[PDB]
Design an enzyme around this catalytic site. Sequence first.
Site, PDB file in Angstrom:
ATOM      1  N   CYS B 108       1.533  -1.438  -0.557  1.00 10.05           N
ATOM      2  CA  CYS B 108       0.286  -1.241   0.173  1.00 10.05           C
ATOM      3  C   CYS B 108      -0.750  -0.508  -0.650  1.00 10.05           C
ATOM      4  O   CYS B 108      -0.574   0.669  -0.974  1.00 10.05           O
ATOM      5  CB  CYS B 108       0.541  -0.462   1.448  1.00 10.05           C
ATOM      6  SG  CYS B 108      -0.951  -0.271   2.487  1.00 10.05           S
ATOM      7  N   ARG B 111      -2.751   2.930   1.108  1.00 12.87           N
ATOM      8  CA  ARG B 111      -2.018   4.074   1.641  1.00 12.87           C
ATOM      9  C   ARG B 111      -2.758   5.402   1.627  1.00 12.87           C
ATOM     10  O   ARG B 111      -2.246   6.385   2.147  1.00 12.87           O
ATOM     11  CB  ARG B 111      -0.680   4.232   0.927  1.00 12.87           C
ATOM     12  CG  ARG B 111       0.295   3.122   1.269  1.00 12.87           C
ATOM     13  CD  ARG B 111       1.589   3.361   0.556  1.00 12.87           C
ATOM     14  NE  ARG B 111       1.626   2.676  -0.729  1.00 12.87           N
ATOM     15  CZ  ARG B 111       2.416   3.029  -1.733  1.00 12.87           C
ATOM     16  NH1 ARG B 111       3.223   4.077  -1.608  1.00 12.87           N
ATOM     17  NH2 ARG B 111       2.392   2.332  -2.860  1.00 12.87           N
ATOM     18  N   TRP B 280      -7.638  -2.192   8.142  1.00  9.96           N
ATOM     19  CA  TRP B 280      -8.810  -3.035   7.936  1.00  9.96           C
ATOM     20  C   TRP B 280      -8.693  -3.852   6.649  1.00  9.96           C
ATOM     21  O   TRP B 280      -7.940  -3.493   5.743  1.00  9.96           O
ATOM     22  CB  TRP B 280     -10.097  -2.226   7.934  1.00  9.96           C
ATOM     23  CG  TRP B 280     -10.101  -1.071   7.018  1.00  9.96           C
ATOM     24  CD1 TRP B 280     -10.335  -1.090   5.674  1.00  9.96           C
ATOM     25  CD2 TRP B 280      -9.899   0.300   7.377  1.00  9.96           C
ATOM     26  NE1 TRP B 280     -10.281   0.187   5.169  1.00  9.96           N
ATOM     27  CE2 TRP B 280     -10.013   1.059   6.193  1.00  9.96           C
ATOM     28  CE3 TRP B 280      -9.631   0.960   8.582  1.00  9.96           C
ATOM     29  CZ2 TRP B 280      -9.862   2.451   6.177  1.00  9.96           C
ATOM     30  CZ3 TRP B 280      -9.486   2.345   8.568  1.00  9.96           C
ATOM     31  CH2 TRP B 280      -9.604   3.075   7.371  1.00  9.96           C
ATOM     32  N   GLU B 285      -8.395 -10.274   0.570  1.00  7.89           N
ATOM     33  CA  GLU B 285      -7.416 -10.875   1.482  1.00  7.89           C
ATOM     34  C   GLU B 285      -7.965 -12.119   2.172  1.00  7.89           C
ATOM     35  O   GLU B 285      -7.288 -13.137   2.247  1.00  7.89           O
ATOM     36  CB  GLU B 285      -6.955  -9.880   2.535  1.00  7.89           C
ATOM     37  CG  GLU B 285      -6.231  -8.677   1.974  1.00  7.89           C
ATOM     38  CD  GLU B 285      -5.784  -7.738   3.079  1.00  7.89           C
ATOM     39  OE1 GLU B 285      -4.703  -7.997   3.661  1.00  7.89           O
ATOM     40  OE2 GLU B 285      -6.509  -6.753   3.373  1.00  7.89           O
TER      41      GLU B 285
HETATM   42  C1  HEM Z   1      -6.414   0.707   6.606  1.00  8.72           C
HETATM   43  C2  HEM Z   1      -6.660  -0.080   5.554  1.00  8.72           C
HETATM   44  C3  HEM Z   1      -5.559  -0.884   4.823  1.00  8.72           C
HETATM   45  C4  HEM Z   1      -5.785  -1.633   3.733  1.00  8.72           C
HETATM   46  C5  HEM Z   1      -7.136  -1.823   3.010  1.00  8.72           C
HETATM   47  C6  HEM Z   1      -4.523  -2.237   3.337  1.00  8.72           C
HETATM   48  C7  HEM Z   1      -4.340  -3.075   2.270  1.00  8.72           C
HETATM   49  C8  HEM Z   1      -3.210  -3.820   2.032  1.00  8.72           C
HETATM   50  C9  HEM Z   1      -3.160  -5.053   1.279  1.00  8.72           C
HETATM   51  C10 HEM Z   1      -4.335  -5.773   0.594  1.00  8.72           C
HETATM   52  C11 HEM Z   1      -1.906  -5.468   1.248  1.00  8.72           C
HETATM   53  C12 HEM Z   1      -1.503  -6.744   0.503  1.00  8.72           C
HETATM   54  C13 HEM Z   1      -0.827  -7.703   1.453  1.00  8.72           C
HETATM   55  C14 HEM Z   1      -1.041  -9.117   0.982  1.00  8.72           C
HETATM   56  O1  HEM Z   1      -1.990  -9.351   0.190  1.00  8.72           O
HETATM   57  O2  HEM Z   1      -0.267 -10.017   1.403  1.00  8.72           O
HETATM   58  C15 HEM Z   1      -1.082  -4.521   1.998  1.00  8.72           C
HETATM   59  C16 HEM Z   1       0.285  -4.549   2.210  1.00  8.72           C
HETATM   60  C17 HEM Z   1       0.980  -3.755   3.103  1.00  8.72           C
HETATM   61  N1  HEM Z   1       0.461  -2.798   3.977  1.00  8.72           N
HETATM   62 FE1  HEM Z   1      -1.416  -2.083   3.873  1.00  8.72          FE
HETATM   63  N2  HEM Z   1      -3.528  -1.832   4.214  1.00  8.72           N
HETATM   64  C18 HEM Z   1      -4.134  -0.998   5.154  1.00  8.72           C
HETATM   65  C19 HEM Z   1      -3.467  -0.423   6.222  1.00  8.72           C
HETATM   66  C20 HEM Z   1      -2.110  -0.470   6.479  1.00  8.72           C
HETATM   67  C21 HEM Z   1      -1.435   0.074   7.651  1.00  8.72           C
HETATM   68  C22 HEM Z   1      -2.145   0.769   8.844  1.00  8.72           C
HETATM   69  C23 HEM Z   1      -0.118  -0.154   7.503  1.00  8.72           C
HETATM   70  C24 HEM Z   1       1.056   0.230   8.432  1.00  8.72           C
HETATM   71  C25 HEM Z   1       0.937   1.049   9.483  1.00  8.72           C
HETATM   72  C26 HEM Z   1       0.075  -0.835   6.234  1.00  8.72           C
HETATM   73  C27 HEM Z   1       1.283  -1.232   5.710  1.00  8.72           C
HETATM   74  C28 HEM Z   1       1.454  -2.204   4.757  1.00  8.72           C
HETATM   75  C29 HEM Z   1       2.728  -2.770   4.406  1.00  8.72           C
HETATM   76  C30 HEM Z   1       4.113  -2.424   4.998  1.00  8.72           C
HETATM   77  C31 HEM Z   1       2.409  -3.790   3.308  1.00  8.72           C
HETATM   78  C32 HEM Z   1       3.422  -4.678   2.582  1.00  8.72           C
HETATM   79  C33 HEM Z   1       3.359  -6.084   3.158  1.00  8.72           C
HETATM   80  C34 HEM Z   1       4.696  -6.643   2.772  1.00  8.72           C
HETATM   81  O3  HEM Z   1       5.607  -5.811   2.453  1.00  8.72           O
HETATM   82  O4  HEM Z   1       4.855  -7.896   2.766  1.00  8.72           O
HETATM   83  N3  HEM Z   1      -1.154  -1.018   5.632  1.00  8.72           N
HETATM   84  N4  HEM Z   1      -1.925  -3.516   2.451  1.00  8.72           N
HETATM   85  C1  LIG Z   2       7.343 -12.921   2.788  1.00 12.28           C
HETATM   86  N1  LIG Z   2       5.999 -12.703   2.228  1.00 12.28           N
HETATM   87  C2  LIG Z   2       5.552 -11.337   2.554  1.00 12.28           C
HETATM   88  C3  LIG Z   2       4.078 -11.333   2.906  1.00 12.28           C
HETATM   89  C4  LIG Z   2       3.555 -10.250   3.615  1.00 12.28           C
HETATM   90  C5  LIG Z   2       2.212 -10.187   3.967  1.00 12.28           C
HETATM   91  O1  LIG Z   2       1.701  -9.107   4.657  1.00 12.28           O
HETATM   92  C6  LIG Z   2       0.350  -8.771   4.348  1.00 12.28           C
HETATM   93  C7  LIG Z   2      -0.224  -7.491   4.921  1.00 12.28           C
HETATM   94  C8  LIG Z   2       0.526  -6.464   5.500  1.00 12.28           C
HETATM   95  C9  LIG Z   2      -0.114  -5.318   6.005  1.00 12.28           C
HETATM   96  C10 LIG Z   2      -1.504  -5.194   5.929  1.00 12.28           C
HETATM   97  C11 LIG Z   2      -2.179  -4.074   6.424  1.00 12.28           C
HETATM   98  C12 LIG Z   2      -3.572  -4.034   6.311  1.00 12.28           C
HETATM   99  C13 LIG Z   2      -4.267  -5.091   5.695  1.00 12.28           C
HETATM  100  N2  LIG Z   2      -5.620  -5.098   5.544  1.00 12.28           N
HETATM  101  N3  LIG Z   2      -3.586  -6.154   5.235  1.00 12.28           N
HETATM  102  C14 LIG Z   2      -2.240  -6.226   5.338  1.00 12.28           C
HETATM  103  C15 LIG Z   2      -1.602  -7.357   4.842  1.00 12.28           C
HETATM  104  C16 LIG Z   2       1.384 -11.249   3.608  1.00 12.28           C
HETATM  105  C17 LIG Z   2       1.897 -12.340   2.902  1.00 12.28           C
HETATM  106  C18 LIG Z   2       3.249 -12.396   2.547  1.00 12.28           C
HETATM  107 CL1  LIG Z   2       3.885 -13.823   1.634  1.00 12.28          CL
END
Ligand code: HEM
Ligand SMILES: CNCc1cc(OCc2ccc3ccc(N)nc3c2)ccc1Cl
Lengths: 407, 411
Positions: B108, B111, B280, B285
Amino acid sequence: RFLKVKNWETDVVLTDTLHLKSTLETGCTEHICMGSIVLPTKDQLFPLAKEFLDQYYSSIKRFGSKAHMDRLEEVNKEIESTSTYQLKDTELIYGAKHAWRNASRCVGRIQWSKLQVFDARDCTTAHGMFNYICNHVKYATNKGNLRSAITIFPQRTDGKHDFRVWNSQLIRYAGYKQPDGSTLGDPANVQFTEICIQQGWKAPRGRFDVLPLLLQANGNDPELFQIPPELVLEVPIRHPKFDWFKDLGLKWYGLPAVSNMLLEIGGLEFSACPFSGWYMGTEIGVRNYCDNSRYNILEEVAKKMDLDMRKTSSLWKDQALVEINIAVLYSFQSDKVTIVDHHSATESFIKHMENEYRCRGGCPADWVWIVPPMSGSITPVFHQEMLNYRLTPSFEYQPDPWNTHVW
Amino acid sequence: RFLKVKNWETDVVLTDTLHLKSTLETGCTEHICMGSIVLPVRTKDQLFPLAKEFLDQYYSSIKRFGSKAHMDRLEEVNKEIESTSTYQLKDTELIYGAKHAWRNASRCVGRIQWSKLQVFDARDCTTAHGMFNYICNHVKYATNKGNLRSAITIFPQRTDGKHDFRVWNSQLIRYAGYKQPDGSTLGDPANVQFTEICIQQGWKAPRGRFDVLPLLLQANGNDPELFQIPPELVLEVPIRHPKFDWFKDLGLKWYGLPAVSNMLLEIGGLEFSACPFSGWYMGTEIGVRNYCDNSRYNILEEVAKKMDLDMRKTSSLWKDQALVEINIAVLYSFQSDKVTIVDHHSATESFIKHMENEYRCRGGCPADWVWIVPPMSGSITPVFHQEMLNYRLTPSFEYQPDPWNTHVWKG
Ligand code: HEM
Ligand SMILES: CNCc1cc(OCc2ccc3ccc(N)nc3c2)ccc1Cl
Ligand code: HEM
Ligand SMILES: CNCc1cc(OCc2ccc3ccc(N)nc3c2)ccc1Cl
Ligand SMILES: C[C@H](O)[C@H](O)[C@H]1CNc2nc(N)[nH]c(=O)c2N1
Ligand SMILES: C[C@H](O)[C@H](O)[C@H]1CNc2nc(N)[nH]c(=O)c2N1
Ligand SMILES: [Zn+2]
């Protein structure tokens, strides 16, 4: 234990069996991954030689043949006698090509088997080294029609007789620190540019001064040599739409020739093995012009484009970064100098991958380095799961000579 | 055992000591790195140590390690495990785990905001309608008329795994995708499977290019039910470009609230199979992934066509050129409607600060480079040249199999 990789754009799944013939270590553990980290005797020597000769004779459909076992014995004996051994020419070439083949960070490996190998193992002096290098440069440049090459100097003996090329590439521009604070030329090369002057180089103190060669033969003090300018093909950088671009005063050299890596074959170490191919566009434009720790001309380009450089959110850097890379590719292709774009290269690599999985059972790959530094997710390598592991023969990093050399 | 990460742009070196607290596996070994691979019922036997570990962490953070409050809580939890085979989290504890699950999310980039997360405790929920209600309030609170707020709503923890609560949607708000008989796809291709599921569950699909999917909610391991988020709760932003006036005519729009709803939240050995959370958008994205990826809306070409690009050879970088414009538009539209958004330069800059801070105050910050680096303009963001260490810390957000692959149909 027979691992699978998925492409998430195409759903295609390949099965990696090749990884079980891995030997060296990754840096990772089950507790912690280090994929994003940049740099992590007679009885030692023979098992290594056997491994190599075993894979060599297998690759020529002569595994366990008379010829095979003969050589295995021949080498076994020479080790016992001389504490090292010499590679047959065929084994040298095979080793070189396979070190490139196994180069997990190299997006360009589809060309791997077309390597021109120059056996420079008779070389004894820096002047000798200079000659072999000039010949390598000329052959590879080929008047713009670049050909892949490697020139191999004598293998390490007792570590006191190391052959080394001190330059990181055969051809790179000097960088000099400035009275006011900033940096003129190329910041990445500043320290080396010093060491050259510390060896008596007379710097024209320009922005694009081709650095001299600093060559070390048989563990001796290294010597300075100037590459004949007529052998250094350069490309003036202009934009195909913007004619103010030319006034930026930019050019780059045609031949990327990495010189600082160690080539390991059958446990033998070649510490001087400059090799070369051709540039992927982004290498010069994204990295060499636009990195903060480099030419960093992003600002200037965006100003000339009159872009709203006030907030990041105009994405002016991105817009500039694109045009710059457009120009680089434009310039090179206009001067008939080989170059590849990141879309073409990555596509080529995905095909090379399918090939390797199909006819070898795998292909070590390092996603952090295979994905280009711009437009990552619109290139096919981005959604390609990769497996990374270390096969031999290999190119390895090695310490910079000036931190080791006994003067 | 200490580990040093170096930043190759600034030569700043940091030292990670937190990785020693790591328990879970990475998938990597000394002989193979899997850092680019996308994917990796519980008895009283292993539960209490998992509980103790968590409770220790908690009491440390509130500076009460070894306290009577701490010891009593361990004893209290112990007995409840041996008697009920599981245990309940105090509200304080639930909030802590939630925030830390985010904080530990090594993928993330956002964070920096982790400590400011609104936690809604839906642990009293019992039905799908009950779930629809909680979720609606989440969307409303989190959206906040465009000034977005981080939030998570936590539904009942798993028991015997035969009574799971799940949100079948991958995000709370998503556009339908419909496969056409000619092989083309109307709407968002990412969502075709889920759309079919819905339709088969009785959803009357308007069959447009921007239809907000219904929620599909499962409570207590029962068959899932359809609900329609009221349109007034779904904030959407029409996408225009600041200089190209023909961009509006592409008829694009996107929703403002990214709320992932398919992950599993792990706290103290307890598993929350339904925990939708939201923050947000980072522009890329929507702009790089949501429109431009070859397996998405794929307007890359249509944008390039209208820009009159040389789309013959890739050497023109028309794809890159069109990509950037599409991201410019996305950021432009969201700022113009005062809907919260962050560009990728801003986000990565902040993550670097966050990360550095974490190394100093916590002794590390687990981070997955492959995911932190943005999907365009990578090396001109500060994270590209930052070495990172990836390891797994609990509390954590985990993946979990799509409920349609693992559900037992009542009928
Ligand atoms: C508030 C602004 C936030 C921004 C700008 C942000 C940004 C991002 C972005 C760009 C990703 C990439 C995911 C992708 O491209 O597929 C991501 C992943 C992730 N975010 Fe954040 N996020 C935010 C808030 C949060 C919140 C509130 C949570 C949980 C309470 C969180 C938990 C996670 C987790 C667990 C991942 C990993 C997704 C995965 O493991 O597949 N995020 N975040
Ligand atoms: C199995 N692939 C995992 C996977 C997780 C994904 O989760 C994206 C994700 C998770 C949490 C978020 C929180 C905030 C935000 N702006 N984007 C967020 C985007 C997206 C694509 C894939 Cl492919
Ligand atoms: C012919 C066209 C070639 C192309 C387009 C190409 C491209 C690349 C690129 C983009 C990188 C990443 C480097 C960076 O961004 O700094 C790389 C790394 C590398 N290349 Fe290739 N290359 C080519 C030929 C060769 C040849 C001939 C060799 C050796 C015989 C080679 C061996 C390597 C090695 C060993 C690395 C990684 C070194 C390391 O681990 O740091 N390449 N290449
Ligand atoms: C000290 N860091 C190691 C390092 C090695 C590198 O090697 C790059 C490299 C190696 C071989 C190449 C061959 C052809 C080509 N076009 N580029 C090539 C680029 C680049 C950057 C770093 Cl940071
Ligand atoms: C195979 C590859 O690791 C996979 O497609 C990842 C790469 N990095 C990513 N990074 C982000 N932020 N989001 C993604 O979906 C992906 N996809
Ligand atoms: C920190 C990071 O590992 C480092 O900057 C790497 C990232 N990926 C790279 N990829 C390529 N092709 N070349 C590089 O120099 C780097 N640098
Ligand atoms: Zn790893």
